[PDB]
Amino acid sequence: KRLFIIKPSGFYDRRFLKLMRFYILLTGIPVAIGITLVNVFIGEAELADIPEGYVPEHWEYFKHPISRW
Amino acid sequence: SGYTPDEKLRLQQLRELRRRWLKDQELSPREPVLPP
Ligand SMILES: CCCCCCCCCCCCCCCCCC(=O)OC[C@H](COP(=O)([O-])OCC(O)COP(=O)([O-])OC[C@@H](COC(=O)CCCCCCCCCCCCCCCCC)OC(=O)CCCCCCCCCCCCCCCCC)OC(=O)CCCCCCCCCCCCCCCCC
């Protein structure tokens, strides 16, 4: 003998959670994929002494490619 | 020293209504229909 369980409407909370997850993932999955691709294929810079008679650009003092960009 | 006749009648009517409502709370064999 199954009975009816009286509950408050859970449709709207579930819809809000689904929408928030959808938008966050929509904007974040490309970001994570791009970060992973950049890390794998464009590694961090390597420390090196400044060659004689050469001045580096202002963005050539950082090691992460995203930070340099 | 016990239920008065008015109290007896009111309790009987309320009990009948309550039992009818509780019976109505039951589920038909198909009630949880699922969307495709
Ligand atoms: C969702 C709904 C809910 C909503 C809730 C609210 C959410 C709000 C979110 C808002 C936005 C988020 C903000 C965050 C932004 C920050 C981004 C950032 O800075 O990235 C950081 C960081 C990136 O670092 P980096 O500075 O860019 O890289 C520096 C190096 O150059 C790199 O070194 P490398 O050269 O080695 O390269 C490594 C590379 C590649 O490395 C590898 O691939 C190797 C790893 C596996 C190899 C192991 C072997 C496996 C394969 C072998 C088998 C095959 C071969 C053999 C087969 C034959 C078998 C016999 O990997 C990476 O680059 C890391 C990937 C970056 C992903 C970060 C995602 C952030 C994006 C922001 C938005 C996120 C939205 C959420 C959705 C995300 C997607 C679902 O990424 C990480 O998170 C690293 C985490 C590593 C930690 C490991 C876990 C250890 C845990 C220790 C603690 C234990 C205590 C318990 C706690 C447990 C908790 C885990």
- Name the DSSP class of B36: -
Q: Which of A68, A18, A14 is nearest to A45 (CA)?
A: A68
Distance from CA of A10 to the nearest CA of B (A): 16
Q: After which residues is chain A broken (C to N over 2.5 A)?
A: none
Amino acid making up residue B6: D
- Are A2 and B25 an interchain contact pair (Cβ–Cβ within 8 Å)? no
R_g of chain B, CA atoms, integer Å: 18
Please report, in angstroms and rounded to a whole number, the separation of the first and last CA atoms in chain A. Answer: 66
Atom of ligand 1 nearest to the CA of A21: 2
Please give the Cα distance from A2 to B25 (Å, whole number).
9
The coordinates were experimentally obtained by cryo-EM
